[PDB]
Design a protein around this motif. Structure first.
Motif, mmCIF file in Angstrom:
data_model
loop_
_atom_site.group_PDB
_atom_site.id
_atom_site.type_symbol
_atom_site.label_atom_id
_atom_site.label_comp_id
_atom_site.label_asym_id
_atom_site.label_seq_id
_atom_site.Cartn_x
_atom_site.Cartn_y
_atom_site.Cartn_z
ATOM 1 N N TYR A 247 75.136 40.465 45.192
ATOM 2 C CA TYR A 247 74.630 41.745 44.692
ATOM 3 C C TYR A 247 73.635 42.186 45.747
ATOM 4 O O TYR A 247 72.615 41.732 46.224
ATOM 5 N N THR A 275 78.796 43.584 44.219
ATOM 6 C CA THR A 275 78.145 44.666 43.400
ATOM 7 C C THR A 275 77.069 45.172 44.311
ATOM 8 O O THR A 275 76.258 44.640 44.518
ATOM 9 N N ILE A 308 82.387 46.426 43.094
ATOM 10 C CA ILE A 308 81.862 47.713 42.247
ATOM 11 C C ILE A 308 80.740 48.171 42.982
ATOM 12 O O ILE A 308 79.906 47.707 43.524
ATOM 13 N N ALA A 309 80.466 49.616 43.147
ATOM 14 C CA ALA A 309 79.489 50.315 43.766
ATOM 15 C C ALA A 309 79.195 51.569 43.228
ATOM 16 O O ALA A 309 80.247 52.590 43.032
ATOM 17 N N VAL A 310 77.901 51.890 43.426
ATOM 18 C CA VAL A 310 77.357 53.188 43.214
ATOM 19 C C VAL A 310 76.481 53.391 44.480
ATOM 20 O O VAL A 310 75.559 52.754 44.793
ATOM 21 N N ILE A 339 85.844 49.616 42.758
ATOM 22 C CA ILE A 339 85.499 50.720 41.515
ATOM 23 C C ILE A 339 84.284 51.354 42.187
ATOM 24 O O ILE A 339 83.203 50.696 42.046
ATOM 25 N N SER A 374 89.470 53.212 42.270
ATOM 26 C CA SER A 374 88.807 53.908 41.647
ATOM 27 C C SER A 374 87.637 54.691 42.174
ATOM 28 O O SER A 374 86.940 53.748 42.786
ATOM 29 N N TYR A 376 84.850 57.931 41.548
ATOM 30 C CA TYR A 376 84.565 59.173 40.987
ATOM 31 C C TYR A 376 83.251 59.892 41.568
ATOM 32 O O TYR A 376 82.430 58.799 42.160
ATOM 33 N N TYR C 240 74.872 44.371 35.480
ATOM 34 C CA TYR C 240 74.835 43.817 36.884
ATOM 35 C C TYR C 240 75.115 42.076 36.588
ATOM 36 O O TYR C 240 74.481 41.333 37.048
ATOM 37 N N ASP C 268 78.085 47.990 35.142
ATOM 38 C CA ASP C 268 78.273 47.040 36.149
ATOM 39 C C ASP C 268 78.680 45.605 35.932
ATOM 40 O O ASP C 268 77.752 44.824 36.308
ATOM 41 N N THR C 269 79.594 45.313 35.004
ATOM 42 C CA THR C 269 79.816 44.240 34.536
ATOM 43 C C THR C 269 81.503 43.686 34.933
ATOM 44 O O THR C 269 82.093 44.812 35.025
ATOM 45 N N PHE C 270 81.583 42.680 34.840
ATOM 46 C CA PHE C 270 83.059 41.883 35.589
ATOM 47 C C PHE C 270 83.405 40.821 34.839
ATOM 48 O O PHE C 270 82.613 39.966 34.137
ATOM 49 N N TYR C 300 79.505 51.915 32.278
ATOM 50 C CA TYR C 300 80.281 52.286 33.318
ATOM 51 C C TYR C 300 80.305 51.018 34.574
ATOM 52 O O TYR C 300 79.619 49.991 34.448
ATOM 53 N N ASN C 301 81.235 51.216 35.265
ATOM 54 C CA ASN C 301 81.681 50.257 36.485
ATOM 55 C C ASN C 301 82.018 48.910 35.856
ATOM 56 O O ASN C 301 81.243 47.899 35.653
ATOM 57 N N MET C 302 83.052 48.815 35.072
ATOM 58 C CA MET C 302 83.397 47.493 34.223
ATOM 59 C C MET C 302 84.880 47.235 34.851
ATOM 60 O O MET C 302 85.685 47.991 34.857
ATOM 61 N N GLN C 303 84.911 45.989 35.340
ATOM 62 C CA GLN C 303 86.012 45.413 36.111
ATOM 63 C C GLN C 303 86.682 44.210 35.202
ATOM 64 O O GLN C 303 85.965 43.231 34.867
ATOM 65 N N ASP C 332 84.776 54.564 33.538
ATOM 66 C CA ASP C 332 84.759 54.030 35.043
ATOM 67 C C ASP C 332 85.080 52.594 34.863
ATOM 68 O O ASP C 332 84.078 51.488 34.928
#
Ligand code: NA
Ligand code: NA
Ligand code: NA
Lengths: 594, 594, 594
Positions: A247, A275, A308-310, A339, A374, A376, C240, C268-270, C300-303, C332
């Motif tokens: 993380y 992440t 997972i990234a922002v 994503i 993905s 965005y 996260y 931001d979960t997976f 958002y950011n769900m894997q 997302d």
């Protein structure tokens, strides 16, 4: 000697006189208590004054010498694991000496000596405004003459806290764990927090090393100032090594502009399952010829997967460069299952938003597969692209991704003029609609290159965007050959321009192209089968075309399909139930060699 | 009794007389030192002579009996974890006795007794030229009568070193950890090195077992001789089990020809996130009816994902076979996210290079998804294929991969004659160009089968390769029905042959096919709308065709589109501005039922 | 004082008088034995009666107070890890008190106090028919006023056994680990078994928390009764955070109808790399506005990636809902690399089988990528679908999957009337044949919606299924606009219906559609170029059509391609070698704006 017996028991040899046998098992070894206690070791066994009295750790205590003595001593017995105890914060307040001094090192790691960090390691303000590498695996100030660090693992539930101190000058470097020429080393579970650093962890040295891994670690707020020149949280510079299930988080405005989570610089490396938030960049994937001494000048088998990234800049950046004597090559890359989004920000307020970036002649980048990702970016972010192709590319393949941002392929006009080969954009890439109506004056695929060869662009829209100038545009300065460029008709009926070739490049001998166009036609007056010809003569390159329009007429019909003539007219055979010259406008699919 | 007190303290019961309370907490249990020391156990507590004196380990000491005594004793208390101490190498120099003797076992594992290997376990030269299984979980020489091994975990930073000893005979077997009928067992973190072995780890026995896992282990140089018959590093032979995040490396020339990293043999198994170098093969994925007793005769839910590999033979091999009484079925497989190359080698110098191999009637293999993988083979390696389809196949689906090697689909002519059903090659598979110009005499898709049914091949080139004989070829011995075969026109304008049906199979009632061809046509002399007819009569199967060529003529135009006639001519209506018989050659897209 | 010396040694301060120095190192700290023993702690140090005598655990002993005292005491020193010893089963038989009482809590966890569970923790029959949460991280009965639980890790090789007790009432709740407002907490390695519970683990509270993880755990038989209202094994309700490499199994018939493995409820979960068997559902992926207080109203950011599952209902369920004051949004999402089947069961005997389910106006679900997955359902299971689209959808994208089940897109007629936008079904989705011949009366894509806009359905068959009524059908109640709907011709020659628009929706201005049809045509009697016209007038919407049939005739040929006329006839120009009125039936590809 009964007085001697009591004194021995109270002495430091006392435990060595009290016998023990495991669980009263008469088959077990007849031991002393000391032997069993000697099976473990902690910082407490070394954190003492010169008279042997234990010292409590705290902000006024430099634990460095004590930790070093523990590492040294365990090393001398062939290795072990030293616990850094929970419930305490252990401060470091001086530089180390010897081989690590050239590396601004604090603690020298040693082979087979693992650190189980359960408590906290903090930097004292001695380090404010100074460089440092908290743990250093080199044994020589010249890394080229250093021995290896082998089998050294740092793990636990604890924390490395950099104290919040800013960099004193942008030329300084700071690191958490510099493993050095590192073979079978790892960091697992540790939180690295509150700093202004260049890296948190570097694996290897100039390709030297193997089997080094960062797993289940956290990296939090490691850039905090305008002084910090650059940041890559983990720097992978040995092969057969990687980062997984970590993380990464930043909150600083500076991080948005300078911080990358990972750099991969050697073959057979990976970045998986992690992440990232608040960073400029996701991963740099590169082969710099300057670091080719350990593992060769090819970086190959490079994986960036299931992250997972922002971010505020570019997700994956590809590059290579050369030295006067050595050439770097990057090939065999996969980017998949990620994503990613560009975080909320004003257009142009950070480095250009991109899922893939090809950065700045030199580049030898090829065999890259980008699939099943993905991406965005919010509708206001003009500077967002599936690929910013800013330097030479020898191959990159995009299959079955979903890209929802302003551009698909971009490069800024009148900047670089990349030579592009083997760019493949499969039809299975889905183009989102978030930026529909925002694209006035813009080309969705803006092909601002010197040349494009052996490339495929199959544009498939999934909604209307009539604001855009075109779906794809080639300026006259871009050569185009041995390429396939197609625009599917769906959602394009109302577009003035679909594909634009400003230099009429679509006429090339080995250019395969189809796109919709509106064409005016006029027929002869013959009753019966009758030809219809285009008014314009711009169609010498067309091999066939076919109707995308209905026929509102009873008394005649235009041709369903057309070929061309030497003068650049289209021509087809329609039918006049009753004679008369006909004039119509029709939407056609224009085809060349497809 | 003050003399007795001192003697008791010095005796092995001494620690049992020294009281202790945790952190001076008067609420804590009033204990003795021995009770706290008894909370842990190590090999030291058993590594003693008959008089209870500890023995130092070393090359002249057989540690086997001591390790066994420790395991036995902890087992008797319901389990625990025994540490194998760091800083020492513990040698094994004899076989074990009892139930493991049939298994050539050294150490018998026991339920709930874990081993924390921090030091090194080495084999002594007693084992040179002999079989062995270092740790064995069976409790009976007949596995069918064995109890289970449950909740047994081997972990740590240590090493199992097989001593470098070669096999004495190719009929021998050698293993590291034979878990047996194993339920909730694992191996984590361990390096297995320097040997000539059949396997490093086997999970389960004939389907019996569950929840067994190999994670974060290294396997290095485990084949070293020409005697070694066969090698699979990890053999997964119980369900709900798998391998993740491991590293596999070989350096021997022999390994290139005989070693596989993983075999999966039961349902709900996986091989993820691992790196392989120097092996012949990546994974065997199979359901052998001989091992169906524990978990059934179906292997289903099999995953091979996100691995990095450099191999010399085949990445994933699919198979099944049968017994006189039991039939094996393999279905529900996914292979995805893998980045694989054939390493540098001469053509034909190792087993045939392949991403997927269907190996040798019997086979019942279906529902296999191959998606999002990259495969590369150097341009000299003639024997490289996306799939070597060498035995019967009942389904395999390829979507969105990038295959850069000599063949896409291959089988050697006049060898096997596979029956193929449900082979699906989606258009989103990208075909690389590394082997362009190397394909003289070769068919990119070489369909050397008995029959092909319910199959799709959508060939899409991404660059020219004019060296190849054809894109796809069906010999007359291959039946073709209820199938779709297409060749996209891009990069094919200059090819003499695109799709070749040597038995005119494309005429089948339920064959759907399109490919480009060059066709000579002649028109009648009529001014106005005028027919053009093919000179050849080979087009009775064609449903439509359309122009892929421009028209260089002003005075006429050939038809844009054609249908056929009973005699096998194509026919279309063009336009003669001025009359006269016309004769042209045109590139057409020939279409049948598409 | 020699009598005093012996008494001190035998007293609980005895170890505090026996000196020790590590490995006889005169540079090490001069310690006492007690100091070294105090570096670790176990339940034994607290599992004592009021006189300090240790108590053996067992079914007649409530260990709760002792475990709580250990946690409390370690907390008071800033943290540590308490071992729950192997070889023993520790029973819990009462509720805890204070802040956890509102939560029916048994043990209160505390910050920085980790539990290393090596033995077994069992529930005593005190808990039969009652609610409980075994470990609770809240410190207040009102969670909104609770402090946080930070840095609390539960790990080891041990077991939490819920005793097999059924729920007493469906309104009760039961949990294993309720971490609370949880920041950097985890559970690793633990087996949770034999219960009737609502959850095994909940991470976070109403969005509050971060960095919480469940890894390498097993969950076995956690629903066993008809009383149990609902079950989600792991409930992720902080960002996260996620679940990886776990195993989930149920055997109860009830679980097939009520149990889900994972719910993801924050950004931001997976959920990765896990194996599920016997559950109703795989993962719920949702943003409920009721839980938006901690992390916002967007998930958002769900894997959901690389999982193996055998389920009886729906793999991934997407949803959102709203409160009177707060609106939830789900966007997302990526679902990729999963291999899923519906287990053997009768049609309609469990909740409707689905890979993706959109469940029940309110829904704001968009930017979902479904790629690279495999799905199978046995041929008898009528209720199986790639997507059951039962509520409003604002986007979902399907690329390069392999779906082998009864329906591709389904919703039951005359139930809900979903509004659908941005549904994209790429051509690279492969449609299996397991249900061929089972589809009498059924539409493969059964578009039972209020409306469909900005959507793509590209139907590609890979085998024949002549049983189906149609490939895709739109009832007249479904509006269709700005959409692309295509049916590829392969395997469709013998189908009476391919695409069906019961309200003639394919005539829409912005509808792009192509599908095959059989059309009767008649020509005029003219020799030479001659028109052919359709007998039916149903083709006013057609922009072009082309032949999918061969021409058996010598003396004439129908047109290869057609356009239309105002009256809804198709019209094309064929060729009469000899004159006469012609009448034919031909298979055409009908095209509108494509
Ligand atoms: Na140029
Ligand atoms: Na045959
Ligand atoms: Na409606």
């Amino acid at each position: 000697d009964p007085d001697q017996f009591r004194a021995i028991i109270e002495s430091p040899e006392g435990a060595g006189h009290v016998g023990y046998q495991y669980r009263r098992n008469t088959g077990s070894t007849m031991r002393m208590v000391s032997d069993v206690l000697d099976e473990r070791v902690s910082l407490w066994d070394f954190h003492c004054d010169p008279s042997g009295n234990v010292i409590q750790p705290g902000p006024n205590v430099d634990s460095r010498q004590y930790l070093q003595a523990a590492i040294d001593y365990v090393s001398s017995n062939g290795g072990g694991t030293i616990t850094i105890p929970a419930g305490y914060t252990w401060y470091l307040g001086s530089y180390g000496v010897g081989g690590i001094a050239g590396h601004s090192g604090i603690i020298q790691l040693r082979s087979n000596v693992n650190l189980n960090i359960e408590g906290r390691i903090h930097l004292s303000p001695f380090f404010d405004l100074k460089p440092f590498q908290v743990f250093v695996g080199f044994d020589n100030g010249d890394p080229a003459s250093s021995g290896n660090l082998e089998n050294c693992h740092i793990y636990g539930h604890g924390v490395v806290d950099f104290g919040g101190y800013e960099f004193g000058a942008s030329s300084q470097l700071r690191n958490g764990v510099a493993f050095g020429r590192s073979y079978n080393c790892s960091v697992t579970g540790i939180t690295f927090q509150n700093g202004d650093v260049t890296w948190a962890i570097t694996l290897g040295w100039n390709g030297y090393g193997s089997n080094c891994y960062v797993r289940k670690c956290r990296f939090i707020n490691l850039v905090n100032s305008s002084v910090n020149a650059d940041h890559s949280t983990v720097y992978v510079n040995c092969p057969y090594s990687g980062v997984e299930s970590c993380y990464f988080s930043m909150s600083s405005s500076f991080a948005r502009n300078i911080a990358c989570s990972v750099q991969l610089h050697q073959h057979d490396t990976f970045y998986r399952g992690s992440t990232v938030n608040g960073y400029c960049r996701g991963a740099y994937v590169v082969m710099h010829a300057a670091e080719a001494a350990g593992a060769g000048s090819y970086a190959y088998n490079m994986q960036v997967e299931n992250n997972i990234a922002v971010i505020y800049g570019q997700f994956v950046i590809l590059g290579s460069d050369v030295t006067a004597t050595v050439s770097g090559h990057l090939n065999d890359v996969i980017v998949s299952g990620n994503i990613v989004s560009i975080g909320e920000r004003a257009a142009f307020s950070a480095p250009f938003g991109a899922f893939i970036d090809i950065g700045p002649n030199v580049q030898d980048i090829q065999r890259v597969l980008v699939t099943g990702n993905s991406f965005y970016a919010p509708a206001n972010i003009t500077d967002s692209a599936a690929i910013t192709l800013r330097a030479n590319l020898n191959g990159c393949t995009f299959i079955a991704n979903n890209f929802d941002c302003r551009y698909m392929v971009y490069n800024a006009p009148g900047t670089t003029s990349p030579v592009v080969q083997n760019l493949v954009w499969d039809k299975s890439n889905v183009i989102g609609g978030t930026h529909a109506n925002q694209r006035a004056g813009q080309n969705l695929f803006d092909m601002q290159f010197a040349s494009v060869v052996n490339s495929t662009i199959e544009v498939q829209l999934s909604c209307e965007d009539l604001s855009m100038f075109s779906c794809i545009l080639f300026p006259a300065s871009c050569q185009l050959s041995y390429s396939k460029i197609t625009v599917d008709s769906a959602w394009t009926k109302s577009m003035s321009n679909t594909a634009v070739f400003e230099g009429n490049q679509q006429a090339g001998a080995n250019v395969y192209v189809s796109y919709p166009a509106t064409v005016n036609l006029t027929s002869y007056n013959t009753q019966g089968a009758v030809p219809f010809f285009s008014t314009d003569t711009n169609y010498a390159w067309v091999t066939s075309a076919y109707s995308l329009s209905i026929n509102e007429n009873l008394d005649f019909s235009p041709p369903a399909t057309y070929t061309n003539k030497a003068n650049g007219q289209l021509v087809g055979v329609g039918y006049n139930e009753i004679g008369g010259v006909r004039s119509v406008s029709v939407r056609l699919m224009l085809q060349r060699q497809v």
